[PDB]
Design a protein around this nucleic acid. Structure first.
Ligand SMILES: [Mg+2]
Ligand SMILES: [Mg+2]
Ligand SMILES: [Mg+2]
Ligand SMILES: [Mg+2]
Ligand SMILES: [Mg+2]
Ligand SMILES: [Mg+2]
Ligand SMILES: [Mg+2]
Ligand SMILES: [Mg+2]
Ligand SMILES: [Mg+2]
Ligand SMILES: [Mg+2]
Ligand SMILES: [Mg+2]
Ligand SMILES: [Mg+2]
Ligand SMILES: [Zn+2]
Lengths: 201, 100, 129, 229, 119, 97
RNA sequence: GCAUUUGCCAAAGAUGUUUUCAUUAAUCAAGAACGAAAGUUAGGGGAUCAAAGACGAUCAGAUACCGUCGUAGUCUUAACUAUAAACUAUACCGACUCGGGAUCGGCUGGAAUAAAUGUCCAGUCGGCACCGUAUGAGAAAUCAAAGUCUUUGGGUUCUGGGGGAAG
RNA sequence: AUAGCGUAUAUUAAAGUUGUUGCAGUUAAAAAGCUCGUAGUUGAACUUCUGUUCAGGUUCAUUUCGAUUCGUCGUGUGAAACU
């Protein structure tokens, strides 16, 4: 608990990143702290923080950022993740329609060959993960309690339901990646509001 | 080629289940196997309803005409022929709570 | 009805190696099971293991890495004269180049190799590779 | 258009003479979809004495039937084996309405299917690994094949078909055992192939230690790939 | 029977794709534009293409359209969508915690971090 | 009870070695860092994750840990676990603050 | 195979046990207890249906499907008989390998109320199942066993070896 | 094929189509309608574990060395399973 870390957990809490649906894929058993009277499943936030940083370290690892690929289906993380790809200089799946064959078919128009893949809802974005499975491509996923971890290498426990949550997760990851890349000081605050990544109605 | 896993009858954990005569034909059929639909209909065509509800002597009736209750039990040949149940594709074949 | 505790423990073991599991709880256990494990460990396959004393039979946790391709029991425990060794090493083992057939002898429980070096034989227990 | 323009990252890495050897591709388990990458490592300059000469063989050609809108529509299937007698083998098959077509497509397939057989020692280890490290098993459809290592100069003891496969793999000495309906040639071939492939799947005792940790070719060569050609 | 075909819709997509800055709500303009821009073997064809492309200009004026990706106009539209107040929603120095959230924080020991208001 | 796992990595891996002490083995496969299985030529789903090294200034060092995982492990959804623990034993996780 | 009320008679599982015995167990040629329906023997009974049969109709022909009748049977005492697609067409005892809700019977805590042989929640033991899923199996259909099988051995009975002839 | 070579019949491999090794039995032939049970076959765990010292070989390794030679010998030193 530095001031930095306290700011991190405060941000995470405020964005309500720790609220989950009621189903537990048992694969998630380890990431979930509390099970409430109202059935709400509560995530340990420390695990979230840790995983965010881990992820950032995987992304810093790929030499050339365009070999990292963010994939999102839902409407919330469209905005957030396109901004993410914006600051992170990587590739975005914009069209919510992921084309079967995108990773597998060298003949497709959307054809990509990332070194690392990042998905917003393993459950929604599943076809992407399945394709990654055919190519030897590792995956960082944003993961709710209901989400299958099959073929998922880094789990960041989240609430991938809300804009607030998803957006501030992609945000924090982006900021940490910036830091690791020396595009940003470790001590310095980032002038980009989280509010950008929110989905406007 | 086992067609159904159910084998058509809902019966497990017993050797024997009571046999029921089919409404339509009267053929004996297994109570598990039987296509059974409970019917609450009205005795009368809606037009006919208007006509009668005019003439009802006791004005203290609010929906004061009885419904007709039927527990209808069909042998398979009958419930197929009679379209109560009809042929579906392999995947749909296992669908359990379908109507509207 | 439990017959052959070595068989229980061995199969449960192989199963967990096969499922990529990191360790096995093993119950119940015998001398023979522990000497068999002491053998596989000495020979490089399993890792460290711990014995748990419940007042009755016992339990045994086994750290595995993964090495064991298979480890079986032969039942019945046949009679294996020195003459028959060839048979059993050709029939049971993956290749000449490795893997062991463990036996009880009046000189104790041995890698079939330890048996050629001790010049004895006769009761087959199991194998691992 | 006799010049190859790579559609794969790996394709680029190969054509431009960057990834060293074929086995290296096999090592980093980089998927080969491009049937060029393979002809690369096997040069067509034609020096008659190399055992690295890449060989193609048609094995099967089948008149397959379909009943379609009152017509009976025939195509051809074919099976093809590709191998250098030194360590490397692939098997492929293709359906097409013209024979030489089925053949070409099957050659291409077989190349995409290249696999690293492992060669072991029977008895005392002296010179040329003449056989397999262990006994292993191919499984395709009903069929099973078991490959058991044989002593020096035993030669290949095996049916005409798996024999042909094995010779392409460069296993000199072997014992065979087969279960199932073996006359189904595609399943027999397949089985033998998968079997041969499982050689490297088996964790033998000599594989026990810590492996080398290397960076993938793509991470090393990242600079190259992101130049625009 | 006025359903329009493959050739025509591919065409219209392309014509907008490259030319959107040149294009008008007027058919008669867009048909001449097309004529200059392209090889179209038929009068009839060109006119069908121009009409559909016009139709799609009108559909674009209203909002997003499937099948056509105009990256310039989409990035302009993206900058359009950003608006940020100075306060955000996100106040680090004041944050509100449920009862259950509090229980999990007790578990991690973070229950007391500065600026946390329980509800 | 870690001992066997450590001793396992203690010495280097070797392909087939004849009595003349040559290396005969065409290539030395990578083995998975969790299950310790062999990484196929043909493995569609086997994966090598590189993770960056971090100086106290947040700086990447350009230094990388590579964690190899094998098809069966990712596929069973053990990956998200395996990795974390592999990073423990290498001393890189959890992340300090 | 078993479905109305109540009373009686003996029996049973699961659960609960910091109760007792202490290997007393598993499977099983011999040898035995059961064993739908139909059928048989000797009495009863006989309402419904209803083989045989008598008739109507239908039909080229109907000794059939349909209709009106109707005997044995159907029910019951004592007895025989031993057979079914007697079907999960899936032997029994024992391990071990995925996930998820629900269900029937015990128990253990907890919560609400109108304070109980009732609710809800969380455990768990045993049942009948189901839904996902297998980098497990299979010729497949499919199978959480039909998995832990050429990487072939936990214990034990039974059965098969091209088709007919022929039970 | 060859001074031999056809054919018929029994038998051997082919046959994991008799199966101990080694087969099948939901639907291809195949689990007995069901229980009890004697022969038969089958049977849970525990007992001088262990440690310390000596010697003899037998193996192993080799940044110990040697001698000679087309490879054995001697020697190290430690390391083993022994006896
Ligand atoms: Mg029955
Ligand atoms: Mg055969
Ligand atoms: Mg009578
Ligand atoms: Mg007439
Ligand atoms: Mg009558
Ligand atoms: Mg209670
Ligand atoms: Mg089988
Ligand atoms: Mg399969
Ligand atoms: Mg299932
Ligand atoms: Mg067997
Ligand atoms: Mg039949
Ligand atoms: Mg005993
Ligand atoms: Zn009927």
């Amino acid at each position: 608990a530095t001031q930095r870390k306290q700011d991190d957990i405060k941000r995470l809490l405020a964005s309500n990143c720790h609220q989950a649906t009621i189903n537990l894929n048992n694969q998630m058993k380890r990431y979930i702290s509390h099970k409430g009277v109202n059935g709400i499943h509560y995530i340990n936030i420390e695990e979230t923080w840790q995983k965010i940083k881990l992820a950032a370290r995987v992304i810093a690892a790929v030499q050339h950022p365009e070999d990292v690929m963010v994939v999102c289906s839902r409407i919330y993380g469209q905005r957030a993740a396109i901004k993410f790809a914006g600051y992170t200089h990587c590739k975005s799946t914009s069209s919510s329609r992921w084309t079967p064959g995108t990773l597998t078919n060298y003949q497709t128009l959307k054809y990509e060959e990332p070194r690392v893949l990042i998905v917003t809802d393993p459950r929604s974005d599943f076809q992407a993960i399945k394709e990654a499975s055919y190519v030897n491509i590792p995956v960082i996923a944003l993961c709710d309690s209901d989400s299958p971890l099959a073929y998922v290498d880094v789990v960041i426990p989240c609430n991938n339901r809300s804009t607030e949550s998803i957006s501030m997760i992609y945000w924090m990851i982006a900021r940490e990646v910036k830091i690791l890349r020396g595009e940003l000081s470790k001590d310095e605050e980032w002038e980009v509001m989280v509010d950008l990544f929110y989905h406007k109605t | 080629p086992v067609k159904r896993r159910n084998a058509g009858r809902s019966q497990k954990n017993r050797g024997h289940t009571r046999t029921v005569p089919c409404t339509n034909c009267g053929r004996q059929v297994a109570k598990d196997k039987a296509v059974k639909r409970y019917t609450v209909r009205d005795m009368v065509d809606p037009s006919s309803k208007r006509d009668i509800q005019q003439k009802l002597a006791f004005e203290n009736e609010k929906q004061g005409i009885p419904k007709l209750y039927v527990k209808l039990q069909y042998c398979i040949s009958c419930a197929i022929h009679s379209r109560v149940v009809r042929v579906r594709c392999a995947e749909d074949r296992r669908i359990r709570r379908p109507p509207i | 009805v439990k017959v052959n505790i070595l068989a229980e423990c061995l199969k449960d073991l192989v199963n967990a190696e096969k499922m990529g599991k990191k360790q096995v709880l093993l119950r119940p256990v015998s001398k023979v099971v522990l000497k068999f494990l002491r053998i596989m460990q000495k020979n490089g396959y399993i890792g460290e293991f711990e014995v748990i004393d419940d007042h009755r039979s016992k339990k045994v946790v086994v750290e595995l890495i993964g090495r064991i391709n298979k480890c079986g029991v032969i039942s019945p425990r046949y009679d294996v004269p020195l003459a028959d060794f060839e048979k059993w090493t050709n029939n049971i083992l993956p290749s000449r180049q490795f893997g062991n057939v463990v036996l009880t002898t009046t000189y104790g429980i041995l890698t079939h190799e330890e048996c050629r070096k001790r010049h004895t034989g006769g009761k087959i227990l199991g194998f691992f590779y | 258009k006799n010049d190859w323009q790579p559609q794969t990252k790996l394709g680029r890495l190969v054509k431009y003479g960057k990834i060293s050897s074929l086995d290296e591709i096999f090592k980093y388990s980089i998927p080969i979809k491009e049937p060029e990458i393979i002809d690369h490592f096997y040069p067509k300059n034609k020096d008659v004495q190399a055992e690295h000469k890449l060989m193609e063989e048609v094995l099967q050609i089948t008149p397959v039937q379909k009943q379609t809108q009152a017509g009976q529509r025939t195509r051809f299937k074919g099976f093809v084996v590709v191998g250098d007698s030194n360590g490397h083998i692939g098997l492929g098959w293709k359906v097409a309405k013209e024979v030489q077509g089925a053949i070409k497509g099957a050659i291409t397939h077989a190349k995409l299917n290249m696999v690293p057989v492992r060669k072991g020692y029977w008895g005392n280890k002296i010179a040329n690994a003449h056989t397999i490290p262990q006994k292993i098993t191919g499984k395709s459809g009903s069929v099973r094949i078991r490959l058991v290592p044989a002593p020096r100069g035993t030669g290949i003891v095996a049916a005409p078909i798996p024999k042909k496969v094995l010779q392409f793999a460069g296993v000199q000495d072997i014992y065979t055992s087969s279960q199932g309906c073996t006359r189904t040639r595609g399943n027999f071939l397949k089985a033998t192939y998968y079997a041969l492939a499982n050689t490297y799947r088996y964790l033998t005792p000599d594989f026990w230690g810590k492996p080398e940790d290397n960076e993938l070719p793509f991470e090393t060569f990242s600079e190259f790939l992101h130049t625009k050609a | 029977g006025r359903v329009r075909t493959k050739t025509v819709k591919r065409a219209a997509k392309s014509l907008i794709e490259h030319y959107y800055s040149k294009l008008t709500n007027d058919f008669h303009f867009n048909k001449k534009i097309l004529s200059e821009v392209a090889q179209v073997p038929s009068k009839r064809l060109r006119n069908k293409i121009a009409g559909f492309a016009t139709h799609l200009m009108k559909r674009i004026q209203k909002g997003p359209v499937r099948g056509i990706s105009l990256k310039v106009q989409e990035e302009e539209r993206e900058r359009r969508l950003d608006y940020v107040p100075e306060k955000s929603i996100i106040d680090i120095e004041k944050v509100t915690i449920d009862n259950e959230t509090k229980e999990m924080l007790k578990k991690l020991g973070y229950q007391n971090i500065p600026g946390l208001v329980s509800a | 009870m870690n001992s066997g796992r450590a001793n396992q990595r203690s010495k280097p891996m070797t392909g087939l070695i004849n009595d003349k002490k040559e290396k005969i083995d065409a290539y030395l496969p990578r083995k998975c860092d969790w299950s310790n299985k062999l990484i196929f030529s043909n493995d569609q789903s086997s994966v090598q994750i590189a993770i960056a090294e971090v100086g106290e200034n947040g700086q990447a060092t350009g230094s990388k840990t590579n964690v190899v995982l094998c098809g069966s492990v990712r596929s069973k959804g053990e990956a998200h676990i395996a990795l974390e623990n592999i990073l423990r034993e290498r001393g890189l996780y959890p992340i300090q603050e």
